[PDB]
Design a protein around this ligand. Sequence first.
Ligand code: HEM
Ligand code: HEM
Ligand SMILES: Cc1ccncc1CCCNCc1ccc2ccc(N)nc2c1
Ligand SMILES: Cc1ccncc1CCCNCc1ccc2ccc(N)nc2c1
Ligand SMILES: C[C@H](O)[C@H](O)[C@H]1CNc2nc(N)[nH]c(=O)c2N1
Ligand SMILES: C[C@H](O)[C@H](O)[C@H]1CNc2nc(N)[nH]c(=O)c2N1
Ligand SMILES: [Zn+2]
Lengths: 413, 408
Amino acid sequence: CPRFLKVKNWETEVVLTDTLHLKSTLETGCTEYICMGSIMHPDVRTKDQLFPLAKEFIDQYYSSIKRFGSKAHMERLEEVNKEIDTTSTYQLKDTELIYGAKHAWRNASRCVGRIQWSKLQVFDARDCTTAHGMFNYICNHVKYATNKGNLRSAITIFPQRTDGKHDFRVWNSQLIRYAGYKQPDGSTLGDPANVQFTEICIQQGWKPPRGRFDVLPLLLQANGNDPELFQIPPELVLEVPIRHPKFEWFKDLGLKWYGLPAVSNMLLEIGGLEFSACPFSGWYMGTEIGVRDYCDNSRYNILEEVAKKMNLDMRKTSSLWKDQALVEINIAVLYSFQSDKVTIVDHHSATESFIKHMENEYRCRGGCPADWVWIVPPMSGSITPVFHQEMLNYRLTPSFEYQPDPWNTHVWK
Amino acid sequence: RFLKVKNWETEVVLTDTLHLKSTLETGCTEYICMGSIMHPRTKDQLFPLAKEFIDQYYSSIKRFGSKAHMERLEEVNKEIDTTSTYQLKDTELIYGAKHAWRNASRCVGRIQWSKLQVFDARDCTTAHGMFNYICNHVKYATNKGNLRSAITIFPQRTDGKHDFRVWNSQLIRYAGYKQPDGSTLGDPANVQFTEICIQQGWKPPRGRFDVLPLLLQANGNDPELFQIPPELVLEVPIRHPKFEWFKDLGLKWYGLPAVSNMLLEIGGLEFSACPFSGWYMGTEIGVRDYCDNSRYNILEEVAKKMNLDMRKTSSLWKDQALVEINIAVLYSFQSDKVTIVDHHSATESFIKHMENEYRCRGGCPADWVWIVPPMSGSITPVFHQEMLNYRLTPSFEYQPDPWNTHVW
Ligand code: HEM
Ligand code: HEM
Ligand SMILES: Cc1ccncc1CCCNCc1ccc2ccc(N)nc2c1
Ligand SMILES: Cc1ccncc1CCCNCc1ccc2ccc(N)nc2c1
Ligand SMILES: C[C@H](O)[C@H](O)[C@H]1CNc2nc(N)[nH]c(=O)c2N1
Ligand SMILES: C[C@H](O)[C@H](O)[C@H]1CNc2nc(N)[nH]c(=O)c2N1
Ligand SMILES: [Zn+2]
């Protein structure tokens, strides 16, 4: 690998130089003969595996606070090494945990929102022992992050993995999501994405209202025990009914969505340590709701219904009736959130901010890993600046990772 | 290993074995992906490449290891020995050109790959000859609006000092002019090429949509200017089926997209002039040509006529105007009976093509970054389709612009 890799923006002709890729730690899935850039996803660490991973991270941390090679750095190194040697693992200091979480976000190549990476409230939940305790921590997170509509990014970090048989897990994919119900006739009520999880909740004892927008209960696993069900207090769940500034009929569609996107099924990796329960939240880019949640054929799938209300010619694809309806739905989502003073960002503003962030990162850090396939929004790609921006994708640690769904691996007691 | 690609909407899983055939580099490594980067002979080099190609050709016609196949290899080897190169048979040229298209990972139009009219222009020696061949291509491909895919192939590279080149990036394009007030008139993408034409004696009309002359280089000589006969240049005035004011924008485009600056590589041989043409997908014109900030950049004017509120981005005024412009382009071509395909129909055909290719070929190299359309991405099926990208030969390649190489 050459020391300097250059990226060009084809619209501005700006050329940036990447050196940070030299710090890449993991595989992308690509090789010199194949690219897997559009592939969605292309037992514990031993003492000897853990040693260099910890040192790599501790070095990175002390370099970041301008104390590299200091007495405190050398002492922390020795202390960590001693701990790994005597206990097969180690515990992060609060400072290091905070640094690690912010950097996992900073390193998330798929995230367009990273200009915000240094403003992340970190909740240390490593003292948690029970599902009830996890419930308490999660409620506090939701309330803090929601902030009456003035959303604040946050992460709550539960105890790290030990032997792999005592994992903390949030079984939910996001803290707040809507149930989906498969009907005897093959139709689906609610969110089809969530049918499997909904069925699991029902089996565990959840009594479902069986509506279109039912907030799912939390299914929480502490210390490897069987997961337990909890209802999020509804006053903590901020929702926005969707209406359109021109179309008075849009409200009659009965759509709404929740304000807080809070992904809860990822794994946070810091210094070789694995935090299998680390729910984090930011705020929405409008297209996540207006394009994907509402218009994906396998999701709420509303294009036809909206197009019919718009009196559109739906006989030919070339009338672009779908595209026309898609825009109006996204206008409505943004309009409804702004009207209710719930933080949201449009895809133009978000990508423009991301470009500035990327330029700053190249300047101060020597690069910014970015996954074009994910960064470019799902509508109007080329009229956003990110479409024209060459990117380099690579994996830096600390990082957020995918992990298997817990019902697939859980040993029921 | 066999690699699986999944469609996340349909849950269809395909199995790729074809990638195992590639030997050319992608640009990525195990540690860095360059998937969004635009651009990541000798006798000794020549024979194995030739052999590789002759082998797959005789395999494709189910006569691998035949007397014909063996005689051909023997023939090619002697020819490389005694002349430092070799000449393709007509059958081989056609097979190779079709497969370069078939292997073009960035092309969403590949369901048409085996329907390609190949014009053999390897006997051409002068720019005048090049002009004749190109006029014939344009006339055949245009076909009064019923567009037909075609490629015209000029003599291959010999020593690199006698290249045939079409200096135009496409056979038909619009001039761009830098103005005193620092603005650009016409297509800003073509400002440089336009200046070269002017320098060489082209008298510019200095309008918004002036069809550029052809600038043609034969056998490494200085390029020469030619005017395409205007009756051969099919154009479409853009109007809108609802907005009667849209025609007042004075917009038009040409019907024939004919890319002329790529290099066609077959069996180690390099065809530096190989203009090829198909037909448009509407977004090429309506989104990129018309709405790129660096191109005609019409969103603001259009949004004005639509009386949209343009104070805040979150009104999505850009997205609204964008859809209407793309409706106009499709409507206009269709009303004039000029072949064009919308991004919905095109991507749908591409998914079917992928399925065909996995079934009969073991895979289909595809570049998601290029395949997904520049508007309404996730409401087309390719957005949800995992793709594998790898490099197969015969292929179309980029080459440097001739004005950065040519000594006059
Ligand atoms: C502050 C506002 C934020 C915005 C506007 C934002 C925006 C986005 C968007 C639009 C995506 C693509 C999601 C999809 O299409 O499914 C994404 C992905 C991602 N975000 Fe951000 N994000 C924000 C905050 C955060 C925070 C606070 C974290 C972690 C601390 C984070 C970590 C990630 C990760 C790891 C991904 C990749 C997800 C995956 O691969 O499934 N983001 N972000
Ligand atoms: C017949 C109808 C066709 C359609 C609708 C079509 C569609 C497209 C589109 C939309 C692109 C993206 C181009 C861009 O965004 O600049 C593309 C790329 C490409 N097409 Fe096709 N195409 C067609 C025929 C052909 C033919 C006949 C050939 C060659 C014989 C071809 C070879 C290529 C190549 C090499 C690329 C990649 C261009 C690059 O890398 O710059 N296509 N196609
Ligand atoms: C996991 C999966 C598999 C197949 N299809 C779709 C998915 C969903 C992708 C999950 N990632 C969603 C995600 C993650 C982090 C986010 C952070 C902020 C934000 N606004 N949205 C996010 C959205
Ligand atoms: C030339 C260039 C330089 C820098 N960045 C970007 C580019 C754009 C690449 C141009 N490719 C255009 C192209 C190629 C083949 C096509 C075939 C059919 C068709 N309808 N359009 C095509 C359009
Ligand atoms: C096949 C493809 O990789 C897949 O559909 C991806 C494309 N890009 C994406 N980009 C974002 N932001 N979110 C997604 O879910 C996806 N899905
Ligand atoms: C940076 C990025 O690679 C570049 O803008 C690409 C993105 N995808 C594209 N896709 C198509 N079809 N055509 C293009 O010119 C581009 N440009
Ligand atoms: Zn790659």
